[PDB]
Amino acid sequence: MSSNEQERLLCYNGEVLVFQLSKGNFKTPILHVRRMVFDRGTKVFVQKSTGFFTIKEENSHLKIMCCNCVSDFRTGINLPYIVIEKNKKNNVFEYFLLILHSTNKFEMRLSFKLGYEMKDGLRVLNGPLILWRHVKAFFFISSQTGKVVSVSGNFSSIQWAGEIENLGMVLLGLKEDYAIWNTKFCVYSLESQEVLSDIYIIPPAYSSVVTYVHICATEIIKNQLRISLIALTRKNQLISFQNGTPKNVCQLPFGDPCAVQLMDSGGGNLFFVVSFISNNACAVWKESFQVAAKWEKLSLVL
Amino acid sequence: CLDLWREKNDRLVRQAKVAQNSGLTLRRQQLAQDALEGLRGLLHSLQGLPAAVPVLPLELTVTCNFIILRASLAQGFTEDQAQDIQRSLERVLETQEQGLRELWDSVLRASCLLPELLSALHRL
Amino acid sequence: APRVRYLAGFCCPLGGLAAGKPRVLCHEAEVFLSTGSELVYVYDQEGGLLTAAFRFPDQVWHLELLAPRRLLYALCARRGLYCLS
């Protein structure tokens, strides 16, 4: 959760991480880390390390926006991050980005010093880059830059983002009828560069319903490219695509899905783990789109 | 895409007819209960799209084949078939709720506007 | 207890890493690594932390070591061979 006296979970290299705002009082709250490891004998999580990070500027309203594991652009090493909103109630919001190292020590990367309040369209990207959204004004700020760039192209949604081979950084999305080649969906090479593809993304019919996207593979035949992307929809469907060709549809039990991830788990036993807003989840097979598990109440999935 | 759906439909019909002519007690049911789930999947693939005037002549056809094959294997009817019919009619109306009677009335007025899919409506 | 230990995690593109080019060499305790990118890492086993990272231009394709000379031979793509102490 995102508040004072609230916490958030994460996962990193077979050991779970927990981040908590805890009021100092003797002083600003202190960001506390507890990394826990599964014991396997006692069937419980034992603490193996912890780490405190001190905050200055005795103002209230500390709020944990987002946490995951991304990378360092300098080293190309996967390390976990936290976003921390510092709200002094003066219509000013810092939004610190912090990175944790293997010494359980923190490192500021972005002070980020905004005036207005940040909302829904938050994403974090490989080189420690933040990508945020208000009224259809998409912005992003990178480490290595320190500067708030605006997205030149006028997008509605940014369904997927991340790095691709030979291109470096990418956003899917749209701008503003059963033909594969039409696609309605502009890729965009970040830093206000060329669209780079509008040839073999999902058809325009599907284009109205999809609410989340997750790419599984990207090959490069010529100046164009070929992506296999999973989507998921308002009508509770999981769809695969290959060169714009819809294959392997599944019909989810529950409603209004939010995200999809991939679990390898052995030789060919590949599962797509789907979460929803109803605090429940499914696991569908790969290689035969067929529901396999239907867990419920599910505060979090990892 | 429409060509792909059409070709899957035709492929499945042809598999069904092959089992109908050839096949023994086990192999018939094998090919048939393959084709039936294929037509389920294709219904779901077509039901994932909003309204689609150009699709309806394929959707009504697919649900007709699905009903016919379902009923012929079961050797009888059910109420799930009436729900399928109700769903396809709701779709035809969404292009342009209460009960099957008023549904049919409004659907047939909407077809007597002469969008030409009467070769599927009359089969329904 | 655990038959496997993850002591580091590196940046990778979609799908995964391209095979062949990444290299891994255990000297005595430390481990030298490349992922077919512009970096070479040293990891001091007994310490999950890295010792040092080396930026090569023009992504590395192959590594070799000499323990008596304490030398690391590295091959870049369109550039040549580097020999670091």
SS3 of chain B: the string is CHHHHHHHHHHHHHHHHHHHHCCCHHHHHHHHHHHHHHHHHHHHHHHCCCCCCCCHHHHHHHHHHHHHHHHHHHCCCCCHHHHHHHHHHHHHHHHCCCCHHHHHHHHHHHHHCCCCCHHHHCCC
Of A10, A13, A220, A270, which to mutate for an interface test with C (greatest number of C Cβ within 10 Å)? A13
Which one-letter DSSP state was computed for residue A43?
S
The C-alpha atoms of residue A77 and residue C8 are separated, in whole angstroms, by 8
Cβ contact A126–C48 (<8 Å): no
Cβ–Cβ gap C13/A163 under 8 Å:
yes
Mutate to test the interface with A, among B45, B53, B62 (most CBs of A within 10 A): B45
Q: If you measure CA to CA, which chain B residue comes closest to A289?
A: B41
Phi, psi of C15 (to 5 degrees): 65, -95
Question: C9 and A78 in contact by Cβ < 8 A?
Answer: yes
Buried b (16+ CB within 10 A) or exposed e, B75-89: eeeeeebeebbeebb
In angstroms, the Cα distances linking A195 to A155, A170, A186, A189 are 12, 9, 6, 6
Chains A and C form CB pairs within 8 A to the count of 50
CA distance A183 to chain B (A): 12
User: What are the chain B neighbours of A206 within 8 Å (beta carbons)?
Assistant: 48-49
- Of all residues in chain C, the one with the smallest CA distance to A76 is C11
- List the one residue out of B101, B122, B9, B124 whose CA is nearest residue B55: B9
Compute the nearest-CA separation of A57 from chain C (Å). Answer: 32
Size of interface A-B (CB pairs under 8 A): 31
Half-sphere exposure of A119 (CA within 13 A, CB side): 8
Those chains having 3 or more beta-carbon pairs within 8 angstroms of chain C are A
CA-closest candidate to residue A77, choices A36, A126, A33: A126
Q: Closest to A14 (Cβ–Cβ): which among C6, C37, C39?
A: C6
Contacting residues of A for B50, CB less than 8 Å apart = 205, 208-209
Which residue, A156, A157, A187, is CA-closest to A172? Answer: A187
- C75's tokens: 């091959």
Among all residues of chain A, which has the CA nearest to that of C37?
Answer: A76
Q: Which amino acid is at B17?
A: K
Q: Do B48 and A206 touch (CB under 8 A)?
A: yes
CA distance A257 to A208: 15
- Test A205 with B44 for CB contact under 8 angstroms: no
**Buried b / exposed e across A126-149, counting CB within 10 Å, b at 16+?**
bbbbbbbbeeeebbbbbbeeeeeb
Rounded Cα distance, A204 and A256, in Å: 21
Q: In whole angstroms, how far apart are CA B90 and each of A186, B85, B96, B100?
A: 33, 9, 10, 10
Strand partners, C10: A77
- C14 → closest Cβ in A12, A76, A164: A164
Q: Give CA–CA dist A148/A112, Å, rounded.
A: 8
Interface probe with C: pick from A12, A40, A78, most Cβ of C within 10 Å? A78
Give the nearest partner residue to A209 out of B45, B48, B54, using CB atoms: B48
